[PDB]
């Protein structure tokens, strides 16, 4: 509250560390469904159903241009990528499986880096 603060957690490396995690996600072999925005002209259903499209290149641009105010807003967009994937894809599809794998991969790096 006013003039009463918890001890300052060091956040000065957060930008660099989120970039490293992102790089690791970008270079994973199962990243291919997630590298670029889904083509909303060529994928029936996507525009109407997925209210907030998200992908790694878009996260990369937002990161590089100071559009994440903190590391939690970054994590929210990453998870959005996987949440969208689950909404639109059957669990037993290559893409559906990619998404489960990438989410697992992300959450471990996240925990190991920050928790």
């Amino acid at each position: 509250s006013m003039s009463v603060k918890k001890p300052k957690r060091d956040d000065s490396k957060d930008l660099a560390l989120c970039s490293m995690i992102l790089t690791e996600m970008e270079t994973h072999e199962d990243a291919w469904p997630f590298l670029l925005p889904v083509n909303l002209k060529l994928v029936p259903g996507y525009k109407k159903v997925i209210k907030k499209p998200m992908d790694f290149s878009t996260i990369r641009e937002k990161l590089s241009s100071g559009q994440y105010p903190n590391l939690e807003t970054f994590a929210l967009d990453v998870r959005l990528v996987f949440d969208n994937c689950e909404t639109f894809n059957e669990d037993d599809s290559d893409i559906g499986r990619a998404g489960h794998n990438m989410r697992k991969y992300f959450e471990k790096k996240w925990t190991d880096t920050f928790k």
Side-chain angles (χ1 to χ4, degrees), residues 55-73:
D55 68 286
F56 295 166
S57 73
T58 298
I59 298 166
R60 171 68 73 193
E61 187 53 43
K62 285 179 70 167
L63 192 64
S64 295
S65 60
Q67 292 183 69
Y68 293 115
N70 57 53
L71 86 169
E72 303 302 336
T73 59

Side-chain angles (χ1 to χ4, degrees), residues 75-87:
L76 284 173
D77 264 357
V78 176
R79 291 164 183 151
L80 176 63
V81 172
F82 307 130
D83 291 350
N84 289 347
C85 182
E86 280 198 53
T87 293

Side-chain angles (χ1 to χ4, degrees), residues 30 32-34 82 85 93-103:
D30 301 343
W32 57 271
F34 316 112
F82 307 130
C85 182
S93 61
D94 298 91
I95 291 173
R97 279 191 284 286
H100 287 294
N101 288 356
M102 291 305 307
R103 181 198 296 276

